[PDB]
Write an enzyme that holds these catalytic residues in place. Sequence first.
Site, PDB file in Angstrom:
ATOM      1  N   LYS A 232       3.154   4.477   6.357  1.00 52.10           N
ATOM      2  CA  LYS A 232       2.641   3.598   5.108  1.00 52.10           C
ATOM      3  C   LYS A 232       1.513   4.557   4.313  1.00 52.10           C
ATOM      4  CE  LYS A 232       3.718   1.216   1.526  1.00 52.10           C
ATOM      5  NZ  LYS A 232       3.087   2.644   0.882  1.00 52.10           N
ATOM      6  N   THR A 233       1.778   4.967   2.947  1.00 55.35           N
ATOM      7  CA  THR A 233       1.079   5.456   2.870  1.00 55.35           C
ATOM      8  C   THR A 233       0.053   5.183   2.057  1.00 55.35           C
ATOM      9  OG1 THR A 233       2.017   6.248   0.482  1.00 55.35           O
ATOM     10  CG2 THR A 233       2.264   7.905   2.562  1.00 55.35           C
ATOM     11  N   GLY A 234      -0.742   5.797   0.900  1.00 52.72           N
ATOM     12  CA  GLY A 234      -2.385   4.765   0.254  1.00 52.72           C
ATOM     13  C   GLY A 234      -2.264   6.253  -1.026  1.00 52.72           C
TER      14      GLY A 234
ATOM     15  N   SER B 194      -2.220   0.990  -0.805  1.00 49.62           N
ATOM     16  CA  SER B 194      -0.742   0.552  -0.609  1.00 49.62           C
ATOM     17  C   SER B 194      -0.708   0.465   1.292  1.00 49.62           C
ATOM     18  CB  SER B 194       0.081   1.304  -1.401  1.00 49.62           C
ATOM     19  OG  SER B 194       0.032   1.108  -2.833  1.00 49.62           O
TER      20      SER B 194
ATOM     21  N   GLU C  91      -4.832  -3.133  -7.520  1.00 50.57           N
ATOM     22  CA  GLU C  91      -4.522  -1.478  -7.587  1.00 50.57           C
ATOM     23  C   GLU C  91      -4.911  -1.336  -9.043  1.00 50.57           C
ATOM     24  OE1 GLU C  91      -0.806  -4.312  -7.040  1.00 50.57           O
ATOM     25  OE2 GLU C  91      -1.127  -2.239  -9.112  1.00 50.57           O
TER      26      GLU C  91
END
Length: 259
Positions: A202-204, A40, A136
């Site tokens: 922003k994470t993923g 993400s 995903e």
Amino acid sequence: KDDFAKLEEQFDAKLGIFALDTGTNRTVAYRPDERFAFASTIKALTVGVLLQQKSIEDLNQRITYTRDDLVNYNPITEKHVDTGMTLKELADASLRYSDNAAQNLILKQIGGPESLKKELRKIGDEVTNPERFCPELNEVNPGETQDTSTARALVTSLRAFALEDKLPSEKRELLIDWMKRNTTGDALIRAGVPDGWEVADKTGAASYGTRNDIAIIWPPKGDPVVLAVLSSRDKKDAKYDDKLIAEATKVVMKALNMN
């Protein structure tokens, strides 16, 4: 450095690290060119391109969708099937909640993974490889380069949109505000930076225990640092630990003498 190998030892994972102190041009690199599933973190870049393409007024355009465009968990977009949501509200959801369905709608608006790649290649990011919508939903296995990037390319591209000239100032401001107000990253880069300091991130996460965070960090006074901490693990179903990312950030900040 070293402390980085020690973290890899401690967490049984592989780290990918790139940081640039935009004040001194100091760089901190650990496997900076190693590929990881971007997960993400791509949502940040996707909004950068959306902003490039749309006036701020154009972000009021409403996008409609059905329950069938939602798969698994989508915390914002599951609330608004009946009305649909505007591009602005979708960008907010995508960035601050990591809303999968909102990201997909935005990606469709900009012309899909092919158009995102084109525009990334246009800002001189020759490494980030978008290939699939909602990657995903795919069982992505190791050694594949589709939907991967590196710590270095992700910092360079986030910097280009967020801090340099790929966006005009008012749109750069929207991107920064959304990332500063992210709700998903408290245990990651944010947990590794000195108290007070503003963070936009922003994470993923994916599989093979992939856990990622990309950020801009402002010291109270002085120019910002842009950072990518990427990580993965050997087994398809490996667990990640957020603490790895918090600790890798601590090492970066040490190396930068802060900021």
